[PDB]
Amino acid sequence: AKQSMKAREVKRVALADKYFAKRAELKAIISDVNARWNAVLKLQTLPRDSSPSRQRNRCRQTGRPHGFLRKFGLSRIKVREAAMRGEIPGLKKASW
Amino acid sequence: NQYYGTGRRKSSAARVFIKPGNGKIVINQRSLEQYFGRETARMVVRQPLELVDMVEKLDLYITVKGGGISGQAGAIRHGITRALMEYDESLRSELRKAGFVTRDARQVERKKVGLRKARRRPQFSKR
Amino acid sequence: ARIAGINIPDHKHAVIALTSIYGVGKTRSKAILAAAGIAEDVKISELSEGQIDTLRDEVAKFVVEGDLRREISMSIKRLMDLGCYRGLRHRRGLPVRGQRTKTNARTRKGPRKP
Amino acid sequence: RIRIRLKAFDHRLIDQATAEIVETAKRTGAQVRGPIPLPTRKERFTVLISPHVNKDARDQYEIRTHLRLVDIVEPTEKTVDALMRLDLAAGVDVQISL
Amino acid sequence: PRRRVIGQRKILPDPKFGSELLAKFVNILMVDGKKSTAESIVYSALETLAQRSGKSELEAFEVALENVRPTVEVKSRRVGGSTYQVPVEVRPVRRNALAMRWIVEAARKRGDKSMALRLANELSDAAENKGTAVKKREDVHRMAEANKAFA
Amino acid sequence: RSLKKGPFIDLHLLKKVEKAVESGDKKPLRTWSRRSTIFPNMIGLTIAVHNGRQHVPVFVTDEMVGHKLGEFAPTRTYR
Amino acid sequence: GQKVHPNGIRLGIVKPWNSTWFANTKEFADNLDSDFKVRQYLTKELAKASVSRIVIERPAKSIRVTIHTARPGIVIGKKGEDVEKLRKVVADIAGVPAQINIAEVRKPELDAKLVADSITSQLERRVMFRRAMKRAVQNAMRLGAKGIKVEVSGRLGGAEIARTEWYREGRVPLHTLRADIDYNTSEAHTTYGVIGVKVWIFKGEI
RNA sequence: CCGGCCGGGAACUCAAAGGAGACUGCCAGUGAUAAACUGGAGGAAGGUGGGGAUGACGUCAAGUCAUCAUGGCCCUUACGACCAGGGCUACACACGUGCUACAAUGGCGCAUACAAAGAGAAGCGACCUCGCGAGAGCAAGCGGACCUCAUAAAGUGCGUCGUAGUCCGGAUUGGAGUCUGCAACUCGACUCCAUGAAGUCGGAAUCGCUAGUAAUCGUGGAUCAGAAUGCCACGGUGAAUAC
Ligand SMILES: [Mg+2]
Ligand SMILES: [Mg+2]
Ligand SMILES: [Mg+2]
Ligand SMILES: [Mg+2]
Ligand SMILES: [Mg+2]
Ligand SMILES: [Mg+2]
Ligand SMILES: [Mg+2]
Ligand SMILES: [Mg+2]
Ligand SMILES: [Mg+2]
Ligand SMILES: [Mg+2]
Full set of structural domains in chain D with CATH:
1-98 (3.30.70.600)
Q: What is the sign of the dihedral through the CA atoms of C89, C93, C97 and C100?
A: negative
- Of G90, G106, G122, which one is at a domain's C-terminal end? G106
- Of G61, G77, G106, which one is at a domain's C-terminal end? G106
| Of residues E64, E41, E69, E66, the one with CA closest to residue E53 | E64
Q: Which residue of G has its CA nearest to D8?
A: G22
Q: Give me the CATH number covering residue G99.
A: 3.30.300.20
For residue A16, report the phi and psi dihedrals to the nearest 5 degrees. Answer: -50, -20
Domain shared by G206 and G114, yes or no:
yes
Query: With contact defined as beta carbons under 8 Å apart, do G20 and A89 qualify?
Result: yes
Q: Do G57 and D93 touch (CB under 8 A)?
A: no
Pairwise CA distance, residues A71 & A93, whole Å: 16
How far is Cα of residue G11 from the mean position of the Cα atoms in its chain? 15
Torsion angle in degrees (nearest 10) through CA of G115, G118, G124, G126: -100
Residues pairing with G149 in the sheet = G168, G200
Domain shared by G130 and G165, yes or no:
yes
Q: Which stretches of E1-151 are DSSP H helices?
A: 20-29, 35-53, 58-68, 94-108, 115-127, 132-135, 137-143
Domain shared by G72 and G20, yes or no:
yes
Pairwise CA distance, residues F63 & D43, whole Å: 56
> Is residue G205 in some structural domain?
yes
> Is residue G11 in some structural domain?
no
Domain shared by G122 and G204, yes or no:
yes
* Number of residues in chain C: 114
Residue D88 Cα distances to D12, F39, G65, angstroms: 15, 70, 16
- Strand H bases with any atom < 7 A from protein Cβ: 4, 12-18, 39, 42-45, 49-58, 61-72, 80-98, 104-106, 113-116, 118-122, 136-138, 143-146, 152-157, 160-163, 167, 171-189, 192-198, 206-217, 222-226, 231-243
> Chain A closest CA to G77's CA: distance in Å?
27
- Of G69, G88, G106, which one is at a domain's C-terminal end? G106
Instruction: List the G53 CA – H194 C1' distance (angstroms).
Output: 72
**How wide is the angle at C-alpha G71 spanned by C-alphas G67 and G76, nearest 5°?**
65
Which range of residues forms the domain containing residue G137? 107-206
> Chain D closest CA to G95's CA: distance in Å?
18
Q: What is the resolution of this structure in A?
A: 2.8
Neighbours of ion ligand 4 (CB under 5 A): C 103-104
- Looking at the 3D structure of chain G, how many domains does it have? 2
Q: What is the DSSP string of chain G?
A: -----HHHHHTTTT---SB-----HHHHHHHHHHHHHHHHHHHHHSGGG-EEEEEB---SSSB--EEEES-HHHHH-GGGHHHHHHHHHHHHHHSS-B--B--B-SSGGG-HHHHHHHHHHHHHHT--HHHHHHHHHHHHHTTS-SEEEEE--SSSTT-SS------EEE---TT-SSS-EEEEEEEEEETTEEEEEEEEEE----
Name the experimental technique.
X-ray
b vs e for B35-66, b when ≥16 Cβ sit within 10 Å of the residue's Cβ? bbbeebbeebbbebbeebebeeebbbbbbbee
Domain shared by G98 and G183, yes or no:
no
Q: Which of A74, A91, A95, A96 to mutate to test the interface with D (most CBs of D within 10 A)?
A: A91
From ligand 10's centre to the CA of E115, what distance in Å?
14
Domain shared by G122 and G194, yes or no:
yes
Domain shared by G122 and G195, yes or no:
yes
Domain shared by G129 and G69, yes or no:
no
CB atoms within 10 A of CB C104: 10
> Is residue G8 in some structural domain?
no
Domain shared by G121 and G174, yes or no:
yes
Q: Give me the CATH number covering residue G156.
A: 3.30.1140.32
Q: Which of A6, A70, A76, A88 to mutate to test the interface with G (most CBs of G within 10 A)?
A: A88
Domain shared by G89 and G121, yes or no:
no
Domain shared by G145 and G194, yes or no:
yes
Tell me which protein residue sits closest to nucleotide H166, measuring alpha carbon to C1'. C16
> Chain B closest CA to E36's CA: distance in Å?
6
> Is residue G99 in some structural domain?
yes
| Domain positions in chain A | 1-86
Domain shared by G120 and G203, yes or no:
yes
Which helix (H) or strand (E) is C60 found in, with range? Answer: helix C49-60
Pairwise CA distance, residues G26 & A78, whole Å: 19
> Is residue G163 in some structural domain?
yes
Nucleotide nearest to A7 (CA to C1'): H81
> Is residue G3 in some structural domain?
no
